Amino acid sequence: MKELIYIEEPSILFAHGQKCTDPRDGLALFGPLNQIYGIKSGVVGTQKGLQIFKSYLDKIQKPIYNHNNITRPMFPGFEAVFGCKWESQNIVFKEITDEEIRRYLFNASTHKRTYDLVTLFNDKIITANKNDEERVDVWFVIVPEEIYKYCRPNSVLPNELVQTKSLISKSKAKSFRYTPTLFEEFNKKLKEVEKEAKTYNYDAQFHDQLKARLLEHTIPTQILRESTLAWRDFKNTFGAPIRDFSKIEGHLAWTISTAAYYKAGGKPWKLGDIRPGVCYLGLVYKKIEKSKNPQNACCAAQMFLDNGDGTVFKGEVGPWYNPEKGEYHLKPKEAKALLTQALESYKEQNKSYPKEVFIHARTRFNDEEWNAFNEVTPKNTNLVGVTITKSKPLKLYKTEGAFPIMRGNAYIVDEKKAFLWTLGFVPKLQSTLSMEVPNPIFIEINKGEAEIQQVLKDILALTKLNYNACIYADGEPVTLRFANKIGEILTASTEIKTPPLAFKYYI
C-alpha cells in the first residue's frame, strides 16, 4: 500500500481579521476584506434589459435560498453581506434601441454581425465614460438572448431573416486591401466592401470581442445575459424555463454579487497565510489560427500574489508553438521580455523584488527558454517552474460507498512530482466538488528546485482566489484557471498594444 498525505484546507481572510475556508460563509458572517461605499452601476441595453437588471437588483436585497443550503450556502442579501448598497437609484442608463439591434443583427455574415453589435455597445460605453465624466464603477452589459444566440462563431442565421447582404466571402476577406481609384462611385462600394471585410480579423463571439476591444480604454464590464437575470421568463415550446436556476438561485446571487463587488474596486478576500515575497506566474498561450504560420501564437502571463486581483501581461506573437510535440515554448527574447515586464511590475507595486518566482504551466519547460528566464531573474530570488497537467491517468476509488475520496489527500511520487486532489469530497459542504470520481492534478517541478509539499500547499491555496465564482474552492490554481479566457480575449481583437492590466478588465 502506498501512503498519501493530507494538506489542510487553506484559509482566506475576510473583514475584522477573521479567517475561514468558505468565502460565502466568511462574507456572510464578517464581510469583505476591502470595503467600498456604493456600486455606481452603468447599464447598456434595451429598456427591457434595464427593467430586468433593476428587478434583479431589487431581488438580491432580500435573502435568496438554495435547495440544499448545506452544499450551497444561502445568500443573506447584498447589504447584509458586503455592507454596501447596489441600488437601482444610481444607474447610468445608455439605451440600445430595438431598431438599432435589428439594423445590425440581420446580416448574413457572423463576423460583421458581431462586430457591428460589439461596436454599438462599445461606443455607448466609451462615450458615456468620456463625455459625462467617469462616475460609475462597473458597466453591466445586459445582452439580449437573440444577440447571444446569433453573435457567436459557428452560428447560422436563417436566410429568411437576413435583411442586409454580405459583400465579401470569409476566405478572401482577410486578403482584401482597399486601394482607391479615380472613380468616386467605385471607391464608395470598395470602402463598403472593406468595411465588411475588416470584421473577419476579429473573433465572431460577442463576449471576447467586447472585452478585448475595450482593453485599451480600461473600463470594468460585467456581461450578463437577459436570460441569466430573468431565467423564469425564457421558456421553450413546453412552457418550461430553458435555464433552470430554481435550486441554485442563492448561489447565482453569490456569483453575480461577488464578481460585481470585485469589478467595483473592492477585494472580497485574500489568502490568509502566505509567505511574504512570493509571486506566482501562470503562462498563457493561444494559437493564432488566422495567420498562415502553423507555429504562430500569442503569449501572456498572469501574476498573482496573496489575492485574486492578478495582473495580465500581454506578450508578443511568435512561433511559440511546436506542432510537432504540441507544446508551446517561448523563444529566448520573449522569455526575457515577458519576465522583465512581470518583475518590473512587481518592483513598481511592492518596491522590492520577489523572494520567489513560481512559473506555472501545463507543459514542461525547455532549457532554451528557462535559461532566458534565469538571465533576467534577479539572483537571490528563487525561480522555479512547475507543471500542472490534470491529464494524468491516476484515479483513487473509495472502497465502499458512493462518495469519493476527500479533497486534500496528496500522493507524492518523489521530491519533485506529486499528485494533488483539488477535487473530491469536502466535509464542510457534506457533498462533492465534481461529478463522478475526481481526477487529481499532477504537479511537477520541471525546472528549478523547491520543496514539493510547499508547492502543493501553495497550489491548494491558489485554488481559492477565484473572484468571479463565489464557490468553496476551484479545481486548478488561478494562475491557470482562466488561461483560455485570457488567450482568446488577446486574440479576439488582433489590434492591441495593451499594457499590464488588472484581472478585472479580462475576467
Binding site: A402, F403, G408, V413, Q430
Partner: protein, 424 residues
C-alpha cells in the same frame, strides 16, 4: 441580567437564527440560543432570570410550533413581572406569513421588519437595543468565528481515520528477463512500419528493441533469418527498472520509455484476439463489450452494457503503461454508445450522452465497472500480454491500492441524488 434570548422554530428558520445570533455575538451582545449548544428547565431559568431582551422569530412555522409558543408564554409572564415595554421583540422574516396565522401574542406587538432586508432589520434591532440601553461588550468577531467553527461546523470536519482506496494502477508482476536490441541493420527494410509485426517491436538506432526473440519475425522479415542472434544486445529488465542500467548506448529514462511504448502496443494487440470491440480516440484506443455478450449484460452481477433512452451505453477501458515509481498499467474508464448495442453513433452525441450518462454514476459504480471489466478480460489472476513467442507480461487484475490517515464521516443522506439531478 444581560443575555439576549432568541426563540425560533427548528429547522425552518435555522439560517436566519444562525445569521442573527452570530452577527449579534460578533457585535458584542451576549445571546442565548439552543442552536449554539450541543432541558426545558434551563430555558425557563434563562428567560426568567437572565434574559434582557426576548427576540422571537415570527415565521409561518414559528407561530405554530408548540415549543416556541411555550417559550413565548414564559417570556410574557417575565415581561409582565418587570417593566420592559420592549421585553418581547418579534422579528418578521416571513413574507408568506398570513395575518390570520400570526399568534395572538405576537400580532398585538410591533415587530421588526426583516422581510425587505436583513441589513435594515439588523439596523432597526440595534437601534432599539441602543435606545433601550441593552448591555453589550466591545465587538468580538473572533468569538463569532469560534462558534461558527465549533458549533455549526462540528459534524462537518475532517477526522483522523485510516482509509484504504483502490486505484486504476494494476501492477505488472512478471517481466521478460531480457529486453533485447536486434542489430538487423540491412535485414530490416528502411521503409517498413515496425508497427505491423505480430510482436511489439520499435526502432532505436540500427537496432530493433523488442522482448521477442531474434527469429520471432521471420515470416514477415525474411532477411532476419541470416541474422546472428549473438549480435543482439540483451539488457536485464531488473537492472532497467531498478535504475542500475545507464550507458552511452542507451539511457535509463530512454529504456523505461521504450518499455512503456512496447507495453501499450502489447495491450493493443492482445485486445484483438479478445471478446471486445474497439473505439478510436484522439491518440489511444478504448475497448468495450457488445450487447449480446455476457449473461444478461452482467459480469459478476455488474452491468457492463445497458440502456439509455434510445441507445445503449457500453463501459470501456483504455490502457497506458508507466513504470515510475512502480511498474503499473493505468486503466482509464470511458463510456461509448451504440444505437442497437453494436453499431456506434459517430458524432457530439457520444459526448453529450456520455456526460448525461456518467453524471448518474459515482465512486461505487465507476470502481465496480472498472474492476469487473478488468476481471472479465483476465486470463487467471492476471492478464497475459504476448511480447514474444515465449515471453510475456502479467498484469494483476487486482489494482494497486493506496491508504491515507485522514478520512471523513460518510453522509448517509445521499446528496449525490440531488447533485446528479442537476442535468441542466
Amino acid at each position: 441580567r444581560n443575555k439576549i434570548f432568541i426563540s425560533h422554530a427548528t429547522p425552518e428558520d435555522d439560517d436566519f437564527t444562525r445569521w442573527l445570533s452570530l452577527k449579534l455575538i460578533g457585535l458584542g451582545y451576549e445571546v442565548w440560543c439552543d442552536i449554539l449548544f450541543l432541558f426545558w428547565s434551563t430555558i425557563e431559568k434563562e428567560i426568567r432570570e437572565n434574559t434582557c431582551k426576548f427576540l422571537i422569530v415570527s415565521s409561518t412555522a414559528g407561530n405554530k410550533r408548540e415549543g416556541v409558543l411555550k417559550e413565548l408564554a414564559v417570556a410574557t409572564k417575565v415581561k409582565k413581572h418587570l417593566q420592559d415595554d420592549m421585553f418581547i421583540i418579534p422579528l418578521a422574516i416571513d413574507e408568506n406569513l398570513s395575518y390570520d396565522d400570526i399568534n395572538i401574542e405576537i400580532v398585538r406587538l410591533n415587530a421588526i421588519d426583516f422581510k425587505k432586508s436583513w441589513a435594515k432589520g439588523l439596523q432597526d434591532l440595534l437601534d432599539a437595543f441602543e435606545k433601550q440601553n441593552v448591555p453589550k461588550k466591545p465587538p468580538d468577531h473572533s468569538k463569532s468565528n469560534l462558534l461558527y467553527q465549533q458549533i455549526f461546523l462540528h459534524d462537518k470536519q475532517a477526522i483522523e481515520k485510516e482509509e484504504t482506496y483502490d486505484s486504476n494502477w494494476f501492477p505488472i508482476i512478471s517481466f521478460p528477463n531480457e529486453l533485447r536490441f536486434h542489430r538487423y541493420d540491412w535485414r530490416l527494410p528502411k521503409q517498413f512500419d515496425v508497427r505491423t509485426l505480430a510482436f511489439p517491436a520499435i526502432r532505436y538506432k540500427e537496432y530493433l528493441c523488442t522482448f521477442a526473440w531474434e527469429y520471432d519475425f521471420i515470416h514477415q522479415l525474411p532477411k532476419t533469418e541470416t541474422y546472428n542472434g549473438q549480435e543482439s544486445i540483451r539488457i536485464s529488465t531488473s537492472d532497467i527498472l531498478s535504475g542500475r542500467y545507464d550507458t552511452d548506448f542507451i539511457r535509463n529514462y530512454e529504456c523505461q520509455r521504450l518499455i512503456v511504448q512496447l507495453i501499450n502496443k502489447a495491450f493493443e494487440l492482445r485486445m484483438k484476439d479478445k471478446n471486445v470491440r474497439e473505439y478510436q480516440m484522439s491518440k489511444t484506443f478504448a475497448y468495450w463489450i457488445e450487447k449480446g455478450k455476457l449473461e444478461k449484460d452482467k459480469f459478476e452481477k455488474i452491468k457492463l452494457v445497458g440502456k439509455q433512452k434510445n441507445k445503449y451505453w457500453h463501459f470501456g477501458i483504455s490502457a497506458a503503461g508507466k513504470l515510475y515509481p512502480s511498474p503499473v498499467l493505468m486503466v482509464s474508464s470511458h463510456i461509448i454508445f451504440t444505437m442497437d448495442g453494436i453499431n456506434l453513433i459517430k458524432s457530439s452525441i457520444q459526448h453529450s450522452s456520455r456526460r448525461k450518462q456518467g453524471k448518474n454514476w459515482w465512486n461505487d459504480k465507476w470502481r465496480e465497472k472498472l474492476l469487473a471489466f478488468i476481471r472479465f478480460l483476465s486470463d487467471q489472476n492476471a492478464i497475459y500480454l504476448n511480447v514474444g513467442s515465449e515471453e510475456k507480461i502479467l498484469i494483476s487484475n487486482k489494482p494497486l491500492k493506496f491508504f491515507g490517515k485522514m478520512s471523513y464521516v460518510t453522509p448517509s443522506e445521499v446528496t449525490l441524488e440531488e447533485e446528479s439531478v442537476l442535468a441542466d
